[PDB]
Write an enzyme that holds these catalytic residues in place. Structure first.
Site, PDB file in Angstrom:
ATOM      1  N   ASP A  14      16.998  41.471  41.172  1.00  0.00           N
ATOM      2  CA  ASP A  14      17.049  42.853  40.644  1.00  0.00           C
ATOM      3  C   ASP A  14      15.623  43.331  40.223  1.00  0.00           C
ATOM      4  O   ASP A  14      15.396  43.698  39.058  1.00  0.00           O
ATOM      5  CB  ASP A  14      18.083  42.941  39.500  1.00  0.00           C
ATOM      6  CG  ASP A  14      19.317  42.126  39.824  1.00  0.00           C
ATOM      7  OD1 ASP A  14      19.877  42.324  40.895  1.00  0.00           O
ATOM      8  OD2 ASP A  14      19.596  41.175  39.096  1.00  0.00           O
ATOM      9  N   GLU A 199      26.924  48.953  43.988  1.00  0.00           N
ATOM     10  CA  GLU A 199      26.128  48.615  42.811  1.00  0.00           C
ATOM     11  C   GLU A 199      24.648  48.839  43.071  1.00  0.00           C
ATOM     12  O   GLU A 199      24.281  49.396  44.115  1.00  0.00           O
ATOM     13  CB  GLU A 199      26.416  47.174  42.340  1.00  0.00           C
ATOM     14  CG  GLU A 199      26.014  46.085  43.325  1.00  0.00           C
ATOM     15  CD  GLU A 199      26.332  44.677  42.854  1.00  0.00           C
ATOM     16  OE1 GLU A 199      26.997  44.520  41.809  1.00  0.00           O
ATOM     17  OE2 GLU A 199      25.914  43.723  43.544  1.00  0.00           O
ATOM     18  N   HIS A 263      19.633  45.319  45.837  1.00  0.00           N
ATOM     19  CA  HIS A 263      19.302  45.702  44.473  1.00  0.00           C
ATOM     20  C   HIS A 263      17.869  46.175  44.449  1.00  0.00           C
ATOM     21  O   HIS A 263      16.987  45.563  43.835  1.00  0.00           O
ATOM     22  CB  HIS A 263      19.601  44.605  43.450  1.00  0.00           C
ATOM     23  CG  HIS A 263      19.876  45.187  42.097  1.00  0.00           C
ATOM     24  ND1 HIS A 263      18.907  45.866  41.398  1.00  0.00           N
ATOM     25  CD2 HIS A 263      20.987  45.104  41.327  1.00  0.00           C
ATOM     26  CE1 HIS A 263      19.481  46.219  40.254  1.00  0.00           C
ATOM     27  NE2 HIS A 263      20.711  45.743  40.152  1.00  0.00           N
ATOM     28  N   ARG A 297      16.729  34.033  44.858  1.00  0.00           N
ATOM     29  CA  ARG A 297      16.603  35.417  45.308  1.00  0.00           C
ATOM     30  C   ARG A 297      15.147  35.765  44.967  1.00  0.00           C
ATOM     31  O   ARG A 297      14.744  35.697  43.794  1.00  0.00           O
ATOM     32  CB  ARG A 297      17.574  36.368  44.602  1.00  0.00           C
ATOM     33  CG  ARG A 297      18.936  36.319  45.258  1.00  0.00           C
ATOM     34  CD  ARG A 297      20.006  37.046  44.464  1.00  0.00           C
ATOM     35  NE  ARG A 297      20.118  36.562  43.082  1.00  0.00           N
ATOM     36  CZ  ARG A 297      20.753  37.215  42.109  1.00  0.00           C
ATOM     37  NH1 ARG A 297      21.369  38.368  42.359  1.00  0.00           N
ATOM     38  NH2 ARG A 297      20.788  36.717  40.887  1.00  0.00           N
TER      39      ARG A 297
HETATM   40 CA   LIG Z   1      18.628  48.694  38.910  1.00  0.00          CA
END
Ligand SMILES: [Ca+2]
Ligand SMILES: [Ca+2]
Lengths: 323, 323
Positions: A14, A199, A263, A297
């Site tokens: 993220d 998302e 993301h 990630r």
């Molecule tokens: Ca964000």
């Protein structure tokens, strides 16, 4: 030509980069232990890989209630002369009766000039309340027409899937003014692989339009980015004004071992003109143990272009550099 | 002039670099969550900052006994054509009655050519047993006169402090042949600040000598490196043959904000000649919450030189680079 050696940041999910008025890039992301919010800063994108972090907020002790587990997807905003961090947190690591995470949305605030000086400068604003008492996360904010808008992901028990994207006008940077409006729900093949998910909302303003990228499907090889767009002179609170593309705008490059780019966030290169797409990706598929605790990630940074209609062109995830 | 932009690796403590005969530098260190052993590889030192790790071993579930908590200071060794990793682990995160950690020493083995191929290639060798059933960690090994030696840190209940340095000849890479011989115990002012400690042994062979560096005192700004040395034609299992320097060989540089350098290892630069000192350090002292979970010990890599007597000259921690 702008081209960074990727992954820029190892083991950060993220990713969110904010170029401030002081000339610094501030980097904020989910750390693998999900136990705190930290910031790093550098004058160059590459400098971020060697930028020493500072913890700005630590999670509450396990068993004490809200904000005590799984600190996810923090974003650093500079609003009306003050620093804010939007993040998601849970009271527990356990799945609920529906096998879902139990996060709610929160905010921390820093009125001091330097957001990295000390964590004693950061104060909790508590939970960002919505219409629904349900799973909510990945909140972002944007400004338009001297109004402040909050964009996030949230579960609706009456809609299939994990989360849909919502919008609301903000009363202040930690409180909603209007009722949440649903902008998108998982529905197309590309966003319903394994899990039905919408998302990671990210906002981009250019060419008389507002672009809203998001991530769909499960966090594996299937994870891809989608996009919604609106003419910026239209009411952003009216879902009928927003257009959803029925196809991904960015996805996996199986051939080049770039699995599940997603993301995303945006920034600008050191030249102050080149647009940058910031996202996380995986370089393998064979995850062992709980995938939540697989820390690999990695943060990618790459430029993007614009077409003759004034739409962003993201292309493919850039191949990795091996040095 | 060999120089790396420091810190080379953000949030990695107990850094260990092994340059293999395939051209690769393999990097192994303690991860902030202390929950697994991972490896990363690159052809250059700077490249390790963008090298994507692979997990080779995960801690046992909490509450199941040994190897379930606080996976610390792994080192990768290539011994008789096979890979071994030495690491310490505890059955609990709790301090004992004496406010001390409860680690024991362990080893994992991989016979496959590629140590990064899959965690499924790695097998547990279990606990490396010693004379004393006590706190032990930071094991390393070295070869001399076609024999294999194990060097580690361990608590003696009958000697003041947390740990002393020991040596023993190995039967095979996971078992001792001779009884442990204490080589050093904390006693000087510089190694007894807050806590009396001797830990983090590292072996360096040159100029007909064997150098044994180690870290002393508490892990704050008082953390410093010391050194023992022996003529390489002498019996290494006889403590009287080793010389201990009464002062640190490497320490904090308060002025440049380089606090508590330690838990060192050594490598050679991409030119195959320049000797490199590898250690971790802190850039601040105002640690909030439990210091064990403050992740900001960063990996530093810098060249060192030799004097006309054939002793290494480590100098001072290299000042940070800000990009
Ligand atoms: Ca964000
Ligand atoms: Ca070591």
């Amino acid at each position: 030509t702008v081209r960074y050696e990727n992954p820029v940041i190892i083991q950060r999910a993220d990713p969110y980069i904010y170029k401030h008025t002081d000339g610094y890039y501030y980097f904020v992301a989910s750390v693998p232990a999900y136990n705190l919010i930290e910031l790093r800063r550098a004058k160059t994108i590459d400098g971020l890989a060697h930028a020493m972090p500072r913890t700005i907020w630590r999670k509450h002790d396990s068993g004490t209630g809200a904000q005590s587990e799984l600190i996810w997807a923090p974003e650093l905003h500079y609003t009306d002369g003050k620093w804010y961090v939007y993040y998601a947190a849970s009271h527990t690591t356990a799945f609920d009766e529906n096998g879902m995470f139990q996060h709610r949305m929160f905010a921390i605030e820093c009125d001091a000039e330097d957001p990295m000086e000390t964590e004693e400068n950061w104060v909790e604003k508590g939970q960002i309340e919505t219409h629904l008492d349900s799973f909510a996360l990945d909140a972002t904010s944007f400004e338009l027409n001297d109004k402040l808008y909050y964009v996030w992901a949230q579960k609706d028990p009456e809609i299939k899937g994990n989360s849909n994207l919502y919008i609301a006008e903000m009363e202040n940077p930690w409180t909603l003014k209007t009722a949440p409006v649903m902008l998108s729900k998982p529905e197309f093949d590309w966003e319903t692989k394994i899990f039905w998910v919408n998302e990671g909302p990210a906002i981009l303003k250019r060419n008389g339009k507002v672009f809203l990228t998001f991530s769909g499907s499960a966090t594996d090889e299937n994870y891809a980015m989608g996009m919604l767009w609106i003419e910026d002179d239209k009411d952003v609170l009216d879902a009928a004004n927003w257009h959803k593309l029925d196809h991904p705008v960015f996805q996996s490059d199986m051939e080049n071992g770039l699995y599940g780019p997603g993301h995303n966030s945006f920034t600008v290169a050191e030249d102050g003109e080149t647009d940058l797409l910031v996202y996380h990706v995986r370089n393998y598929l064979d995850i062992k143990g709980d995938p939540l605790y697989d820390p690999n990630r990695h943060t990618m940074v790459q430029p993007f272009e614009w077409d003759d209609e004034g739409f962003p062109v993201f292309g493919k995830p850039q191949p990795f550099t091996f040095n």
